[PDB]
Amino acid sequence: LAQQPWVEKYRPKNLDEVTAQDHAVTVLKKTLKSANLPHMLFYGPPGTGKTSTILALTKELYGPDLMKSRILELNASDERGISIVREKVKNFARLTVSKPSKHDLENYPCPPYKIIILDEADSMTADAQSALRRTMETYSGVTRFCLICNYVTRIIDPLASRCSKFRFKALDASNAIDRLRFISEQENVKCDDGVLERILDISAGDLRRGITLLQSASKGAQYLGDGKNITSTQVEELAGVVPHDILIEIVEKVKSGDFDEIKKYVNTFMKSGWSAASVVNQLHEYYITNDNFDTNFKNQISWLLFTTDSRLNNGTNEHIQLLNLLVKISQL
Amino acid sequence: LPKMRPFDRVCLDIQFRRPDANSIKSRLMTIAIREKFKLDPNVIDRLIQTTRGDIRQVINLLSTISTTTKTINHENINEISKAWEKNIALKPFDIAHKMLDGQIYSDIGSRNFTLNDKIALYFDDFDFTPLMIQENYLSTRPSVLKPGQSHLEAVAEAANCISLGDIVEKKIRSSEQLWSLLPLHAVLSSVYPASKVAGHMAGRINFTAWLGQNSKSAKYYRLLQEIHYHTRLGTSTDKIGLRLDYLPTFRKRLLDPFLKQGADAISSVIEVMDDYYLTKEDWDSIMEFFVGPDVTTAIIKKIPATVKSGFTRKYNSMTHPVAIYRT
Amino acid sequence: EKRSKENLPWVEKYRPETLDEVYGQNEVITTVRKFVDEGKLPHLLFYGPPGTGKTSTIVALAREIYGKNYSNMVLELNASDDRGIDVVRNQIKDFASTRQIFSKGFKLIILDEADAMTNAAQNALRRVIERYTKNTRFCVLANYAHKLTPALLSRCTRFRFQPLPQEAIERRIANVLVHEKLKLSPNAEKALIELSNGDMRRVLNVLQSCKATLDNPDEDEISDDVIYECCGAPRPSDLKAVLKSILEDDWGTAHYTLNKVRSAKGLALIDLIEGIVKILEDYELQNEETRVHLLTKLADIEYSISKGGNDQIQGSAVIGAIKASFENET
Amino acid sequence: SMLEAKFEEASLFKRIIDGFKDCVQLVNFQCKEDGIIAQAVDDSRVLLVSLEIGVEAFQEYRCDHPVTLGMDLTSLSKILRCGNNTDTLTLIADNTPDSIILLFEDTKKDRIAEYSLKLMDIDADFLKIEELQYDSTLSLPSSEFSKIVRDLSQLSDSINIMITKETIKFVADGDIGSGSVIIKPFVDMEHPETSIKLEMDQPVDLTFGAKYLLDIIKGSSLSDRVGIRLSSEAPALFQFDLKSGFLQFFLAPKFND
Amino acid sequence: MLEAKFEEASLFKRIIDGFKDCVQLVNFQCKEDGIIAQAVDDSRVLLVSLEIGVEAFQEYRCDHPVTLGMDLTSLSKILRCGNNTDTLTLIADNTPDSIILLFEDTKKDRIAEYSLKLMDIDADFLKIEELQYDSTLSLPSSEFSKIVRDLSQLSDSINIMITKETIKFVADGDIGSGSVIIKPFVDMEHPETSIKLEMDQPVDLTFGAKYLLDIIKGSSLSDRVGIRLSSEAPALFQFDLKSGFLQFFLAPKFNDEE
Amino acid sequence: SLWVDKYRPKSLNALSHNEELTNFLKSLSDQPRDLPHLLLYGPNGTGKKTRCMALLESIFGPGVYRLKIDVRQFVTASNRKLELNVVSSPYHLEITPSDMGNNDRIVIQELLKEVAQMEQVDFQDSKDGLAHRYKCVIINEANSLTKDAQAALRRTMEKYSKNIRLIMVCDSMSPIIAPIKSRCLLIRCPAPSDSEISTILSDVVTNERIQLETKDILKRIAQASNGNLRVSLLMLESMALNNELALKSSSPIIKPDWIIVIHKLTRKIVKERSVNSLIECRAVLYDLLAHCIPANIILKELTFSLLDVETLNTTNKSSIIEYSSVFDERLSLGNKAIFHLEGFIAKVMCCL
DNA sequence: GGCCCCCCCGGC
Ligand SMILES: Nc1ncnc2c1ncn2[C@@H]1O[C@H](COP(=O)(O)OP(=O)(O)OP(O)(O)=S)[C@@H](O)[C@H]1O
Ligand SMILES: Nc1ncnc2c1ncn2[C@@H]1O[C@H](COP(=O)(O)OP(=O)(O)OP(O)(O)=S)[C@@H](O)[C@H]1O
Ligand SMILES: Nc1nc2c(ncn2[C@@H]2O[C@H](COP(=O)(O)OP(=O)(O)O)[C@@H](O)[C@H]2O)c(=O)[nH]1
Ligand SMILES: [Mg+2]
Ligand SMILES: [Mg+2]
């Protein structure tokens, strides 16, 4: 509706709206007529369409009437301790399947099992996870398990072995452009050539972020009230991308090599609010793609950037990390 | 033990020491004569050294050994002493003293007190040993310094290892409850840092002061939270911002004018309190936060008692608004 | 179950029912058969990695010993159930100290996944095991031996379940193909074994996914391309090309090749790193520090990837680490 | 509806449900034309409870096809407690039911309560475990058995029952002491309910746990007499006869060593 | 200046006990007409309205309307120590920082008068303008207890449906589902167990276990309840007083599927 | 009331800096029905909270500024009763779960879901009495939340999208997890320029009747604030109060006590490098930490004061910054702040 | 007899 965000408004409803996950969507569709759906483990980067995919599968399998009575969904917002897993999940799995109505049996396949969707399974403790090993196996004939996670390493080996793994690929401009273009036409958003491709490139495998950026750009254009097409500079500004001029000044200061000047420039730069991750990514792109540096310089800078990114991913101060990275690069 | 605290000053305290080897020699010789087994006097002391002041334990030892061995001489004293050695967990001070000794970390000492022995010593009290090590590793004269290494470098290495052990401890007590890492925490927190500064203590061993500091910081944070939520309706900031930026400016209005206008600044202070929903207890808490050269204890004490009495009377003689109801 | 067994997943549909359907554990199977054929059945400790068939083996042994009505004559406790000190004290002791109900026989207790049990329960079970040994026997299934107390280990005869050999997996695959009327190319079989890592559950899951992927299973043969598409794993040719470009080509073209290979089929960086590690493990290096640097840097990169982060930076780091490590060869 | 069973009084079903709720957790009911049967096995796999209720215990009973219903006894007891002790209880089930409907209807008013309990998938058989010719059988008032069990369970957790020539002996050996109770069969023609009967083929000596006997004697409120049947190499049978059905407890004797 | 001599102090005790859990800080406006109060729940989801008319009090008089934000927990603390049959009065003064509760009695010995502190609670110009509510009825409270306590053990929803000649309580959950239907039933010998119901359009609204359980805890105040349900307005549960009543506007739960 | 609080703008049209951000906020508030979840990030003391309040006032009526404070009770797994101070408005809600430490997740799993799972009573500006809009919840200092709370929020912000909207303000996005960033609309708030700060200070001075001979006075305050506006206003107020409401060209810049303590520590470490010096630094660190001074701020200020020493060389500064970078991560992954601060100080003293 | 609540280890 008009009172919902575009990310939720254009959420897939069926399995035919999934764009770049055909390798698993085809298997899921075949399971509709095969009726032998196994335990599933959906893993991949954020914003790839895993929860949407499982919701669409459950809808197409059961119907809006049987969805409530055949699906049990537990996520990180509910207590999922060992006791909860041993009591509630066990009781639901061991229960008999709800009796479908003639309407549902006529218009839906109505598979003879229920589904438990453990979203954000990577947040569950190992002890709690170990309690499901026999639960899934014993009641496989009446219940099926769907574990959705972002880090596959957080799932214990027995559960990964029991579940069938499904990897969701990143959504880039080469496979997710069609959906973004369709959304743009539906919303009557006018954009210049390459704007959607730039949005998808900035998103880096996150269609939700791209949709949010498109919505923000459309809102800005509507508020402007000029009718001009959306450009790429405005999109970059809305995405927090550092201007190329600032990057040029940064690399020139690094090439200068003076510690005091670099420190002063970093102090001035950090007052603008630019995210450290974006700066590091832009610096990595510029330095790696440049042909004016030798093999050793790139060899060292790659490791330096990797270390800086790893340290930043732990939630540290951006100023200190950025200053250290720039100082190290200047001494390469 | 803390459970004995209530008995601090309500009973006559009578302390019994471990009997000396000469106060029980006659009794033990009499027992040996009565039981018809030879007991060489020259080896008697070691028995107490084996039993460590326990007359009951040494009597039981004699009773057991005399069952089949009728002679107790220097030929078999070593075997019985080794077999009947009593193991008692050391106290945190004793643990710190022993772990910070350079003898055990030498080539010859290591063969007697092994790494497993040090880990067991740590495990005797795993809730206090890391704190004692972190507290008492800066007051030693190391004797195991590497050729060319200085005391400061060893101290820095020990501090880095202590930080790593702190990270390990934080991971141990997380939601995963990874207690299997406790042995690792033994090395990263106590054994390794002590192995770099092992030697002779430069002074008395001091109990860890981190607990009192933590309690004081918790109390200070509670008072800061109370003040922040009392002034939330007026300020646009968090408790951290309130402490770092707002408190000096507030002092400029709630303490400074008492030192210049005397008792004539009561009305302005009360007006500020009403504007920011502050109370006298909040005033005391705020004036107690400052550190460095801006301490307010001496300044507050030097304030004339008449001014403080008048301020209290004025505060208690009028109604004040309340920000939070039923706190 | 519901309806028929055809609706069950292949992992559960093909669960062995008898002991002769367990493959890759000939020694253990023969030993247990001999034990149950002449009455000398001791306490068992089946230690092994996931997907070896320990639970299936013990279930088949119980069925052979007791028969069809084996569920009512054995006490099966697993991690899904509450197994505390009180449970061991009361329920297990009563089961071990009481006669059978339906028919004459000895009492069997199967503590599956006992590695998730508390130390107090394990300590309590010692005297229960050693007191009712005449009429009761204990079987414990484990994946990690460090979670079991030494006292419990001392009272059980240890049997280790090795990873499934190649021939056993081929035989099971042939049986599954016969049952499902499916055809598999030899290269597809080799790829399946390579990616299987000795787990039969992975074999069954990947085979089911491949069957679902086929346009028409009646007259379509699964090839290596189908397996790679279903699992999304990189092809060996792509790994070889990426390694060649990294080793000999310069920075720009190596980066371009890696990006193109990854974007062609949406490959993941961790699988590429794993394949490169497998390929380089067979390289006859002339120096040791080169291998040390390779292993350390690749382990660091894998650990960083496990927690997420920027993928492009991680790939550049992989390339730089490989180049720097191979620079030491001279 | 397909299966519709009407009870004369909800208390009639409630008392039988309460008679064995404290010893088993999961129950399976098979409803047919002859009546309703059920067997439950406790977690320790030591005690088996077998209940049968005939059509004569129901006002109106209709069952076209056999129905298998898996339930949790705790949930069923809770729902029965939710119902009153003066309303009419109706068991309602449909083909391949996913739930069982308990209908409480009050004749005085127009209040109808319809509770639904989700059924449970418990795939198991009955095996009709019953020894053709037990070594010995006996029958005696339930109150006396309950008193003896409660008295002898206060001394020890194990009770030994010996059947020999014209005598039944219950022995408990504990820490504080020991106790023995001996009863000889006799027939009274003026209070037949208090008579004790015994028919033996071979002497018997079997040991049982005190907790299981304590839980078994809890069904003394459903009958005035209890029949105990003992047989070597066979579970001991404790039968309480109902108005038109019966309740049975099969208890495995402890291993002798 | 103001007095509210009660016919029975237990009446006021039950009045306060009826909404102590829902709200704790409520403004009481004491006009010559009577006592009026309306407090918004701290979550801005439940409005506790209340009014006691002049008729209920044995002797009520006031010279100038005054609003008192006096607490409720302290009210219970004061009233719990009192006897059963008394004539509580609420005397105050021109500038009251406290209100003197005169616990008068017919006898001159059983007197337990106390003093209750007053506290400044802000009040807003809230409005309860009437709307064309589809259904409204009244029925005893014992049935409410027997139904709510029964359905709470099976689910967290006490969904209420009001159809012609039918009143349905529905509660579904993990264990199962439970539905109880009550219908117009009048007893000539016992008129108290009767339902007075009038509906215009069908209504169905899902309500919560905790809210209704708390409400029925305080249902000892009035032996009869009042249901009012609409289609777009917050349905309200009322407890009739001697001359006024105690209303509870509770917002219905959001429906995601519809 | 303090000048920093008395002159706070209460509308989007009253903002005096970052006009582009004001235009973006106006565009967002033009059609607030489809407003996505918002995440504001930028330097501290720039006006992120003020801009959020202005946006809320643009969306709802002026009544968003009538705030109240209530107390909420929570129970943990150990039956521990915890109190949370909740700041609420008739149109919006504000919460700071970090005040409950590792228990912040409970607030996500108990409070927010209570508000988002069902409707509200709106007897004002309505005909039926029920709200016909969404509620805006402001989670202050989202970077301080634990990972579990964010994971719980992941589905909460999605399955109640059109009933509740979240506006999260933070000074850094590094602690924020990727899923939360993906589910939020990023808004960058740059710090005001020196000229804008000087203009605001001049407006305050001219509206407060403060004598000022030269405007350059205010300029210095800006160079002493490093982009912070709250610090600038507080420093101006303190200077005015310390100089009899008359700023002079010779008036010094008033620094807070903790900054002076950190400077003392820095110039003691530089001058003296010994174990006894490290013990004295331990005492100083205990004193600093016991009085509600965050460890991260202490480390940052100590590092940036060490780097400002005119006697140290490039190698020493590089070693100091490397050690600071390592020990910042150590602090982020540790509990005892001093355990890492002492290590950093020891490493710095060794490298000098 | 059953909840409900509080204190205390947790590696080999
Ligand atoms: N394959 C997709 N096809 C179409 N839209 C998608 C797809 N994936 C994501 N989106 C869009 O982005 C929005 C969010 O997708 P999500 O289902 O939340 O991704 P996700 O994989 O669940 O993210 P995580 O791992 O739980 S943080 C959807 O409502 C869609 O509008
Ligand atoms: N030796 C085997 N022969 C045939 N199939 C096997 C074999 N081992 C495992 N499988 C297959 O994989 C499925 C699971 O085997 P499991 O018995 O569950 O392995 P497991 O060792 O018990 O796993 P863990 O150690 O409890 S995680 C079986 O149903 C079989 O279909
Ligand atoms: N005149 C003016 N003052 C502002 C503006 N924005 C912020 N301020 C002032 O700066 C003070 C601090 O801003 P604050 O909201 O706390 O920033 P935050 O803590 O980073 O979110 C505020 O109390 C205001 O007085 C603005 O746009 N115009
Ligand atoms: Mg999702
Ligand atoms: Mg298994």
Short mmCIF file of C-alpha atoms in Angstrom, two decimals, chain D residues 75 78-79 81-84 108-118, chain E residues 143 150-151 153-154 165 173-183 185:
data_model
loop_
_atom_site.label_atom_id
_atom_site.label_comp_id
_atom_site.label_asym_id
_atom_site.label_seq_id
_atom_site.Cartn_x
_atom_site.Cartn_y
_atom_site.Cartn_z
CA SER D 75 -3.30 -31.23 28.92
CA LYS D 78 -6.21 -29.45 32.61
CA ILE D 79 -9.05 -29.21 30.08
CA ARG D 81 -10.55 -29.33 35.19
CA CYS D 82 -11.62 -26.33 33.11
CA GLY D 83 -14.94 -28.12 32.68
CA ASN D 84 -17.46 -28.43 35.49
CA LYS D 108 -30.21 -25.92 33.37
CA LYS D 109 -28.85 -23.06 31.23
CA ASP D 110 -27.96 -22.49 27.56
CA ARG D 111 -24.19 -22.42 28.11
CA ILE D 112 -22.04 -24.61 25.85
CA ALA D 113 -18.26 -24.94 26.15
CA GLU D 114 -16.32 -26.42 23.22
CA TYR D 115 -12.66 -27.15 23.97
CA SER D 116 -10.27 -28.41 21.28
CA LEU D 117 -7.09 -30.36 22.03
CA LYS D 118 -4.60 -30.85 19.21
CA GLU E 143 -19.00 -16.06 34.59
CA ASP E 150 -10.18 -21.00 31.96
CA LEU E 151 -9.12 -19.49 28.63
CA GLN E 153 -4.30 -21.29 30.45
CA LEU E 154 -4.86 -22.15 26.76
CA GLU E 165 -28.37 -14.01 20.36
CA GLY E 173 -2.93 -21.23 21.28
CA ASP E 174 -0.22 -23.87 21.16
CA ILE E 175 -2.04 -26.40 23.35
CA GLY E 176 -5.28 -26.02 21.40
CA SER E 177 -8.42 -23.93 21.11
CA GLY E 178 -11.26 -23.11 23.49
CA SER E 179 -14.57 -21.39 22.80
CA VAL E 180 -17.35 -20.61 25.28
CA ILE E 181 -20.75 -19.25 24.22
CA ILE E 182 -23.10 -17.41 26.58
CA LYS E 183 -26.64 -16.57 25.52
CA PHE E 185 -30.64 -16.43 30.04
#
